[model samples]
Target: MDIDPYKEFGATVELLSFLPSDFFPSVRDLLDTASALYREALESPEHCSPHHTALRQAILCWGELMTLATWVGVNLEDPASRDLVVSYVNTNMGLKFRQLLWFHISCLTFGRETVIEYLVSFGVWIRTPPAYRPPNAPILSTLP
Candidate 1:
């Protein structure tokens, strides 16, 4: 993981090597995990019916995040640089993703399968967390 900044971008001086060599593998692993989760959910109709769409969205975001991180690491001296990375990641990540990573850690809570009104759409269970979440509010954390 020892990427000599000079060797990476020979003869070019860099102000900061913010990205470690581990970044790529780490993100690749994370993205792989996201893909696996989505794939797993998709394989089972019970889990897939209510959560596949959301997982797909999150996996897409994870791809974008990984791509940007890779690009930034490779072109650290480019114009716009990390700014573009920051902007894209903030815009692309999903709320369900944030919630799952932060609060729940392994799943989705969408309601299409439930019989309760508040929960599913017309019955009676109280909705602890509504489906409408601000995906781009503060943006998701990209550092892993």
Candidate 2:
């Protein structure tokens, strides 16, 4: 596929520019594929696939943006900013082949407690009750 690096770069620059100076440490180093995907999605929203590549790109962009924002001391709890971050992360994390991203997010959210608490809370206690039991079996009892 022919990719235009400038388009992606430009979009990233535009978005990042809206944030405060301290919102991001550096935009010099970012995933090119993710940036391209974001540009494509923005340029072709109607044609963009909602749950696949486009969404993945959006998610990656959002996640990276949030990480950078946090690094730069932005309060993520702000409704607008929080929504943007959550939308992107949730879309990407919900993808079927998103194990890598999901794992990374899990670690970010709960670190070692992710698998331990998951198994302990979900495996033994959470799923044993009639009201709280999952309709479907859990996919993973522990993290990889």
Candidate 3:
């Protein structure tokens, strides 16, 4: 699960600096603008908006981590391995995981520093996904 640093994360560092101070309006708005430019860039042969593209990529990449987590057993359907896995998902969240966490700071507060800091951590986590041991399997043994 080692993300080839050559692509996904490489552009993130450069574009995080471009996050607007007082940004704009909503997370939805930023995505709206970015997506418009993004679609145009896609339709054209030329790469237009690298900054917007990075934001869009980061949003998608952030979402991809969720799937990676669940598939890798960070989340479970039952509590068979409850003790060990509670530490993994914090699955208590449903909708919280729905929207783009990449823009969370943008949605709530200010500054790209906090956003990118979290992105760095997000990058580190998904870059090396843990193995998916099945629930209710021998891995749950507890003699204590």
Candidate 4:
């Protein structure tokens, strides 16, 4: 599915174009799968439980990871650019988001959904991956 990055995400073209062309779609699938799992779990009588809350939190983090990737993906072709992206995100991204992005980058280099997989290891299951929209871009200014 073709997407105009600016139209859909309200971000500059460079924000979404720097990574592997396939990256954003794969992240979308993972996030949708995670959301489906959460919804499925919700119907199992534990919907009101803290487990649901935690799962919801993880799902939200998954969504943000996509946005964070796009934001961080800008100018990531070299070492200095990488450090600049890191510093920019750390400074501007909130504490919670910055930690999730950091952990994801640490686990998979640049980004991967380790948190969702950890939930799977705890017996959370995925339904068929469904179509997912790109998350709304954060209302942020260009990195310095």
**Candidate closest to the true structure, highest lDDT:** 3
- Please give the ranking of all candidate structures by TM-score, highest first, separated by commas: 1, 3, 4, 2
Better of 2 and 3 by TM-score: 3
Writing each residue's lDDT as its tens digit, candidate 3 over 36-58 gives 54455545555444444444565
User: For residues 10-122, what per-residue lDDT tens digits would candidate 4 score against the true structure?
Assistant: 33334333232322233345445445544566446554644345445655765585577677576367777777766665454433333332223223321123433332332
Best-fitting candidate, scored by TM-score: 1
Question: Model 3 RMSD to the real structure?
Answer: 17.4
Per-prediction count of colliding residue pairs?
3, 0, 0, 0
TM-score head-to-head 1 vs 4, winner: 1
**What TM-score number comes out for model 1?**
0.32
Residue 75 error, candidate 1, Å: 0.6
Query: Per-residue alpha-carbon lDDT of model 1 for 23-107, expressed as tens digits?
Result: 1233345445555545566555574432455455555666676687777768787657667766566444432234323211132
Predicted candidate 2 versus true structure: per-residue lDDT over 7-106, tens digit per residue? 4312222222232333222222223433443445545547443233444564566577657756644544467776686556545432321332333233
Comparing candidate 2 with candidate 3, which one achieves the higher lDDT?
Answer: 3
User: Each candidate's TM vs. the true structure?
Assistant: 0.32, 0.23, 0.29, 0.27
Q: Give the TM-score comparing model 2 with the true structure, all chains together.
A: 0.23
lDDT value for candidate 3? 0.43
Cα RMSD (angstroms) for every candidate in the order listed: 18.1, 16.3, 17.4, 18.3
